[PDB]
């Protein structure tokens, strides 16, 4: 697992900074050509790499899904891209206008809603930046260039304070301030200065998303037993892994300063992990056969 750290890191970074504004088929094609480039230059990488399985933790995934995010894996990946854009302001393009309440639920009462069409937009944005509340701006296709310094993050550090210039007056920058830009027009004209400096994330529904959603519906309704078993095995694997790591830490704490009972508990946990792995080793091919079987319905749907 240490021989392929660089390849996985490269794939994850490229996936974050390049694939935010692509549908599923384009994402698959560019992932295939990236894997081909990795294999041509003799850089090893994880064969069964999944972005959610590598960078999305279970607590974060449950927190996002309980906030109102769709069950689709595409929306999970886009949500992870949005929350992992720590340096650049993310640009959520949601035609359904669904994610405003999602981010509001994620950040609670700190969420402050502005817009680019308000008469008192600039002074309230300055107040929000001073207080440091999470800011969501609607109608991003009408981007007012007054916050061009905030998009480019061109600050000057006045000693112990970070300073941005908005309008003709000086305003401080709080450390907890965040900026989200929301748009609802897929055909809107984003300014190139704004477009090149934001994390453009497309929360849209397409024909590839039609394929994925038909498969999700037929999985969750035609045979819910397989999906429920997969969810249960993933949950128990995560819980048993956390308990095993905690037990290992307790064992080393005891050995540094019953011990046979703790060793027996660790052995039982390891046997449980082995049994769960053996059970799950004969479950993914079943999902592969279901994928191969329910393709004609998807072609008919598209």
């Amino acid at each position: 697992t240490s021989q392929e750290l660089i390849g996985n890191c490269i794939i994850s970074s490229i996936y974050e900074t390049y694939f935010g504004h692509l549908n599923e088929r384009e994402r698959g094609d560019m992932l295939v050509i990236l894997k081909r480039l990795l294999g041509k230059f003799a850089v090893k990488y994880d064969v069964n790499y999944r972005f959610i399985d590598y960078l999305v933790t279970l607590d974060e995934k449950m927190k996002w899904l309980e906030c109102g995010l769709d069950k689709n894996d595409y929306f999970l990946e886009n949500m992870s891209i949005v929350m992992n854009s720590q340096d650049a302001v993310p640009f959520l393009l949601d035609p359904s206008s669904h994610m405003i309440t999602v981010i509001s639920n994620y950040y609670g009462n700190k969420t402050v809603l502005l817009s680019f069409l308000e008469e008192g937009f600039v002074k309230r944005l300055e107040n929000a930046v001073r207080f440091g509340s999470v800011v969501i701006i609607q109608d991003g296709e009408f981007f007012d260039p007054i916050i061009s310094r905030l998009i480019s993050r061109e600050f000057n550090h006045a000693g112990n304070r970070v300073t941005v210039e908005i309008g003709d007056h000086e305003v401080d920058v709080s450390g907890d301030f965040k900026l989200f830009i929301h748009s609802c027009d897929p055909s809107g004209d984003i300014p190139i200065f704004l477009r090149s400096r934001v994390r453009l994330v497309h929360f849209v529904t397409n024909k590839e998303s039609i394929e994925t959603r038909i498969f999700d519906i037929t999985l969750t309704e035609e045979n819910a037993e397989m999906q429920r078993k997969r969810e249960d095995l993933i949950k128990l694997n995560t819980e048993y892994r956390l308990k095993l790591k905690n037990l290992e830490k307790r064992l080393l704490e005891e050995l540094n300063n019953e011990l046979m009972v703790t060793l027996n508990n660790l052995k039982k946990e390891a046997m449980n992990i082995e049994k769960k792995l053996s059970e799950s080793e004969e479950f993914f091919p079943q999902f592969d056969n279901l994928v191969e079987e329910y393709s004609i319905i998807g072609k008919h749907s598209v």
């Binding site: 900074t17 390049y18 990236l34 480039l37 003799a42 260039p145 061109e154 000057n156 550090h157 190139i192």
Partner: protein, 646 residues
């Protein structure tokens, strides 16, 4: 006396045109000069009028927003109301000179006002006063004008009822012999500074003429919309060579050849886009130098191997590349410490762009038009260079709820700061800083002329003249006439104001209007930096991934073609990582179907920063996990050894 724009080297075509000009003007007949944008209509006509003992000149420059009140005000300062209108000089006649009569715009029903006014005043020999209603007969006031052909955009086709009164003369480009003679005279005037190379005036002039001819024949307008050359490029080459020789050190023949080659690079080949075009131009310089200047001991004439600058010394000489990079690094560190902080990575292309921006910002009335992809580093380099030269950066705060009032008052504040307070200003204009065509017309006015007339009028004009008189009296100068004060004002503006245009999407229609505008193209120096190439991307990536732990696994050198490696030949994991990142950026922009639009390297930089942070975090976590499992294994071995011993 080559900086002077009014100087005209007398050739056979010039005296022929001056003679037919005197014949036509003495014939009581208007004259229309038509030809290519570098033929020399304005300078021939001004030479013919200034050196005449019978004709005065009135300078008028037409724009799209031009009314007959401008012409009335221009005549009223050179005539007396005694009807009958007469010039102030009794014997010398008066000539009214119009610039680019094609540029006045049609009204809502297809009729330009000023050309109909001119046809009225030189057909009936008079005009009717609007607020008083009498016929003011004009006796000896003449009308001339120049114009580009109406084919190109911005040049409106003109009514035959107006052109039937004025004789039309066509001015073609001068032949090879005439250009050779003119620039032989210019190069003799230049080389009077260095008399030991006076025998090389003819080969330099012939080489410049051949270079201009080859560039005109090679890069036609069919490739790109801005690939048009003219004798103005050769004149700018001569002016740049003189400016560099004047402030340079003691020069050798090789130094002179390299200096001329650097000027040719900075003038004839900063508008070029394709890499094949730049390679062809490099081959063209090598061929020209070998043909006309058969000298040995000549180094590389590549774009990055010609670093002429005056930051590192008191005189304009060639500087070492590594010393210049170190100086630029330290200056940028200081600039980020004192002004806005941007973590930039220094590469050869950025150094070269800094050099050419600095060269174009030290010229009198020197303006720039930076064209390139977004996030290529145009605004930050312009701010850094303007900070180096001591200019004051003025960035217009133009937002969505803004109109001509805010932009005009920003322009007025900048102009007043330049004149009254005597502070040099580098005005940075973005394509999103303009919103309507009126701002574009304001830029055309400010760039073609040295002043914008309608900003100061009435009370504004009176207070401007009062402030001009106050400044003149405070400086210990004596100027009385308003014409002298206005000349001093426009001279101060042309000396202390520089305009730099930032263009991000050259294929846009608004940016196409910006590029194809007559005043912007004929005055600004285009620096098409374009998108990053493979070498610059390799340098940035190598400077970014060297600060992260990356080489900790076994690596075998992969067999690969020579053309698939953009960095140095692959020896480690870092070169492989850089190659994969560049290859994927190229493939991503290929499969996104960008077409011929410039490719922003913002995705590449964001990917590199995310990769650095992610690799650091994952390596730290992996090291902690491995240390944890090894210390646990060591404790386990100690426990089993204690059990075995006991």
């Amino acid at each position: 006396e080559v900086m002077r724009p009014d100087i005209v080297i007398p050739t056979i075509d010039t005296i022929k045109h001056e003679k037919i000009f005197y014949d036509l003007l003495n014939s009581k007949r208007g004259i229309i000069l038509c030809g290519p944008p570098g033929s020399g209509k304005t300078m021939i006509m001004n030479n013919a009028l200034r050196n005449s003992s019978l004709y005065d000149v009135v300078g008028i420059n037409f724009s799209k927003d031009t009314t007959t009140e401008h012409i009335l005000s221009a005549l009223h300062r050179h005539t007396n109301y005694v009807l009958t209108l007469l010039p102030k000089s009794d014997i010398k006649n008066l000539v009214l000179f119009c610039d680019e009569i094609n540029l006045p715009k049609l009204d809502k029903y297809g009729s330009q006002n000023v050309v109909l006014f001119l046809r009225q005043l030189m057909e009936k020999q008079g005009f009717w006063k609007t607020p008083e209603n009498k016929w003011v007969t004009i006796e000896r006031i003449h009308i001339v004008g120049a114009c580009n052909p109406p084919t190109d955009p911005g040049r409106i086709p003109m009514s035959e009822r107006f052109t039937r009164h004025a004789a039309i003369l066509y001015l073609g480009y001068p032949s090879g012999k005439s250009l050779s003679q003119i620039y032989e005279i210019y190069y003799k005037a230049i080389f009077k500074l260095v008399p030991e190379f006076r025998s090389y005036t003819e080969p330099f002039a012939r080489a410049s003429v051949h270079l201009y001819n080859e560039c005109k024949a090679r890069y036609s307008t069919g490739l790109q919309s801005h690939y048009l050359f003219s004798p103005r490029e050769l004149t700018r080459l001569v002016r740049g060579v003189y400016t560099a020789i004047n402030t340079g050190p003691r020069q050798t023949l090789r130094s002179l050849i390299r200096l001329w080659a650097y000027e040719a690079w900075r003038i004839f080949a900063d508008r070029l886009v394709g890499v094949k075009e730049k390679n062809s131009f490099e081959q063209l310089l090598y061929e020209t130098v070998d043909k006309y200047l058969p000298n040995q001991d000549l180094g590389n004439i590549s774009s990055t191997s010609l670093l002429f600058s005056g930051l590192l010394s008191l005189d304009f000489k060639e500087v070492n590349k590594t010393d210049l990079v170190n100086f630029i690094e330290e200056r940028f560190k200081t600039f980020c410490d004192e002004e806005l902080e941007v973590p930039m990575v220094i590469h050869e292309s950025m150094v070269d762009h800094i050099l050419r921006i600095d060269r174009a910002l030290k010229q009198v009335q020197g303006h720039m038009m930076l064209i390139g992809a977004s996030r290529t580093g145009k605004t930050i380099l312009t701010r850094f260079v303007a900070w180096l030269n001591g200019l004051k950066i003025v960035q217009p705060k133009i937002h969505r709820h803004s109109n001509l009032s805010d932009f005009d008052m920003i322009l007025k504040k900048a102009i007043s700061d330049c004149s009254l307070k005597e502070s040099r200003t580098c005005l940075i204009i973005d394509e999103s800083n303009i919103l309507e065509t009126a701002f574009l017309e304001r830029m055309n006015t400010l760039l073609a002329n040295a002043d914008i007339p309608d900003l100061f009028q009435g009370e504004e004009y009176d207070k401007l003249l009062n402030n001009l008189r106050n400044k003149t009296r405070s400086l210990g100068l004596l100027l009385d006439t308003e014409q002298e004060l206005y000349d001093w004002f426009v001279g101060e503006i042309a000396k202390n104001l520089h305009v730099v245009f930032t263009i991000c999407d050259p294929t846009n229609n608004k940016s196409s209007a910006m590029i194809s505008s007559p005043a912007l193209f004929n005055r600004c120096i285009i620096n098409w930096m374009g998108d990053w190439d493979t070498k610059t991307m390799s340098q940035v990536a190598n400077n970014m991934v060297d600060v992260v732990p990356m080489e900790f696994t076994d690596f075998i050198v992969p067999e690969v073609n020579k053309e698939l490696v953009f960095t140095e030949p692959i020896q480690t994991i870092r070169d492989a990582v850089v190659n994969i990142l560049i290859h994927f950026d190229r493939n991503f922009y290929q499969k996104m179907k960008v077409g011929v639009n410039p490719r922003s390297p913002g995705y590449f930089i964001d990917g590199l920063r995310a990769l650095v942070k992610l690799v650091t975090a994952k390596y730290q976590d992996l090291q902690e996990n491995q240390r944890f499992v090894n210390v646990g294994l060591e404790k386990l071995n100690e426990s089993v050894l204690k059990v075995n011993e006991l």
